[PDB]
Amino acid sequence: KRVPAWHAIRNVRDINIQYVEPLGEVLPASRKGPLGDPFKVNCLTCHQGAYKPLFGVPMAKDYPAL
Amino acid sequence: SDKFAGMYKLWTFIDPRRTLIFIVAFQIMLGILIHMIVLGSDLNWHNDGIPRFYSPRPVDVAVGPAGIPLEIPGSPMPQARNYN
Numbered sequence: 719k720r721v722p723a724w725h726a727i728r729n730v731r732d733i734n735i736q737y738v739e740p741l742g743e744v745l746p747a748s749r750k751g752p753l754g755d756p757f758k759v760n761c762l763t764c765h766q767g768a769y770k771p772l773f774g775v776p777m778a779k780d781y782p783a784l
Numbered sequence: 785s786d787k788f789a790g791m792y793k794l795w796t797f798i799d800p801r802r803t804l805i806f807i808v809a810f811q812i813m814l815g816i817l818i819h820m821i822v823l824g825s826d827l828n829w830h831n832d833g834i835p836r837f838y839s840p841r842p843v844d845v846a847v848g849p850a851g852i853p854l855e856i857p858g859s860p861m862p863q864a865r866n867y868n
């Protein structure tokens with residue numbers, strides 16, 4: 719289980735550097751913090767206290783848009 | 785030869801009570817030890833399955849491409865293993 723976590727780190731950096739932080743131009747002042755940056759993603763943003771998000775039910779295969 | 789004829793005199797400076805106690809205790813200790821050493825071996829006779837096995841036999845679990853058991857897709861706890 720150490721080897722997926724190693725990739726997870728890199729993955730999260732991608733989500734925050736390429737996508738979520740550049741959205742700080744579009745969102746209103748409601749979605750920002752004290753220092754003026756938007757909300758970002760953690761390990762807890764999808765696991766939410768479980769060893770796999772939603773215990774690992776494979777939802778994404780049914781939708782060819784994703 | 786006749787050189788051992790005076791060995792009984794041993795008991796005039798070595799006493800019977802302590803000697804008997806030591807001997808008996810040591811023999812029981814040795815008995816238990818040798819039975820346990822032979823049990824922990826290939827010569828084990830309780831678990832050999834001769835003349836027949838009496839308890840159910842172990843069943844292996846299939847592994848994944850990472851060499852550990854597969855996770856079950858809605859279990860609220862991960863799966864156990866004993867080897868890492």
Ligand code: BCL
Pocket residue numbers: 811812814815816818819822827
């Ligand atoms: C499958 C059977 C097991 C075995 C299972 C047990 C168990 C279980 C016990 C013993 C016990 C004894 N065993 Mg045994 N024993 C084995 C093999 C041996 C061998 C050997 C050379 O292979 C020897 C020397 C012994 C010796 C002994 C004694 C130390 C001890 C007897 C009590 C005592 O106070 O002894 C003093 C007496 C002597 C030292 C003389 C006895 C030696 C005997 C006759 C061994 C001869 C065997 C050997 C093949 C002879 C080769 C010579 C010639 C070619 C014929 N065993 C094999 C591996 N043995 C018992 C014990 O510790 O009680 C307190 C005990 O509970």
Ligand SMILES: COC(C)(C)CCC/C(C)=C/C=C/C(C)=C/C=C/C(C)=C/C=C/C=C(C)/C=C/C=C(C)/C=C/C=C(\C)CCCC(C)(C)OC
Pocket residue numbers: 790791792793794796797
């Ligand atoms: C009243 O009567 C009087 C008193 C006057 C007369 C009495 C007469 C009588 C009854 C006398 C009786 C006399 C008796 C019974 C005498 C018995 C004598 C015996 C049996 C002596 C045996 C001696 C054995 C010896 C000294 C062996 C020594 C072995 C040594 C030191 C080995 C060392 C080995 C090493 C260190 C190797 C290590 C190996 C390894 C690999 C495990 O180490 C890491």
Ligand code: HEM
Pocket residue numbers: 719720722723726727730759760761762763764765769770771774855862
């Ligand atoms: C840095 C934080 C993260 C860590 C340390 C992390 C760690 C892990 C680990 C170790 C696993 C494998 C679980 C297992 O097999 O027992 C896993 C699975 C998973 N994670 Fe993450 N994760 C993180 C962030 C995320 C994020 C943000 C998401 C959502 C975008 C996510 C989605 C998933 C999914 C869907 C799986 C299941 C994949 C599978 O079935 O093998 N993780 N994560």
Ligand SMILES: [Ca+2]
Pocket residue numbers: 732736
């Ligand atoms: Ca990318």
Ligand SMILES: [Ca+2]
Pocket residue numbers: 829830831832833834835
């Ligand atoms: Ca048997």
